[PDB]
Each structure stands twice: as C-alpha cells, then as structure tokens.
Design a protein around this ligand. Sequence first.
Ligand SMILES: O=C(O)[C@H]1O[C@@H](O)[C@H](O)[C@@H](O)[C@@H]1O
Ligand SMILES: O=C(O)[C@H]1O[C@H](O)[C@H](O)[C@@H](O)[C@@H]1O
Ligand SMILES: [Ca+2]
Ligand SMILES: [Ca+2]
Length: 129
Amino acid sequence: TGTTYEAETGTTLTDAVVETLYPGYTGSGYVNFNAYTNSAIEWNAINNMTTGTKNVKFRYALESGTRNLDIYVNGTKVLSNEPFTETGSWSTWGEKTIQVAMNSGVNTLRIVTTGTEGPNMDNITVTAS
Ligand SMILES: O=C(O)[C@H]1O[C@@H](O)[C@H](O)[C@@H](O)[C@@H]1O
Ligand SMILES: O=C(O)[C@H]1O[C@H](O)[C@H](O)[C@@H](O)[C@@H]1O
Ligand SMILES: [Ca+2]
Ligand SMILES: [Ca+2]
C-alpha cells in the first residue's frame, strides 16, 4: 500500500497555491501551479524503510494537453521534462507512475514547471518497486 503524501500540506509551494475548486481530491485540496516555468511543489518528508527504486504515483487532473515537469530527488534533478498527459477534465483525477531511486529514511522530492505549466496535483503515493 505504501504512503500517500498530500500535495497541499506538508509541502513547500513556489508560485503555486492550494485550490478546492474542482471536486474529487483527497485530503483538504490540491495544488494549482501558477507559473509556466519555475512553479514547484517540494515534499520535505518522504519516509522510506529501504533504499531502492520506488514507484511514485501522482494523482492529478489536466483538462487538455500535455504538461511537463522536472523531477528532483534529494536535490538532484533525476527526470527532465517528464510528461503528464491529459485526463480530459479538471475533475477527472488520473494517475501517473514514475520509477525513481530513493534512499531509506527521510528524502525530499520536488516537481517543477519548465515552460508548459503543470497539472493540478492532488497527492503522491510512494511504494517500493
Ligand atoms: O521502503 C519503501 O520503499 C517503503 O517504505 C514503506 O514503509 C513506506 O510506507 C513506503 O511509502 C515506502 O515506499
Ligand atoms: O490551466 C490551468 O493551469 C488552470 O486552468 C483553470 O484556471 C483551472 O481553473 C485551474 O485549476 C488550472 O490550474
Ligand atoms: Ca495552473
Ligand atoms: Ca490532496
């Protein structure tokens, strides 16, 4: 089952805001990226039992188009312009899973816009791959 970390709480936001306009989110809301570039969500407390490759499953909404995010783990960029494809509606919450290396113990993960803005981001769920 893993751990789910909400996007809206327990994070640091840059040019991004907590929003509740579209229904279906988990927790208290979701995050809306505001800037086409350099908007960010940083999770500061991703807590793993083991070091290894993780499945990081983003729950997100994206009415149309593809939007690409840079993905950092423990301060190092590890995915460049990773695509988030459309869900069809701002209240259609889809899932996208990436496979990235993380350490045991406490880690950080930061996702950043790069020129196409971002999906509305609900949470991430991290499991061992
Ligand atoms: O070590 C791991 O990968 C897993 O550790 C578990 O305890 C966490 O609940 C899960 O989120 C991590 O993916
Ligand atoms: O296209 C976007 O990024 C934005 O479009 C609308 O403003 C929508 O209400 C937002 O939730 C979304 O973030
Ligand atoms: Ca937005
Ligand atoms: Ca949420």
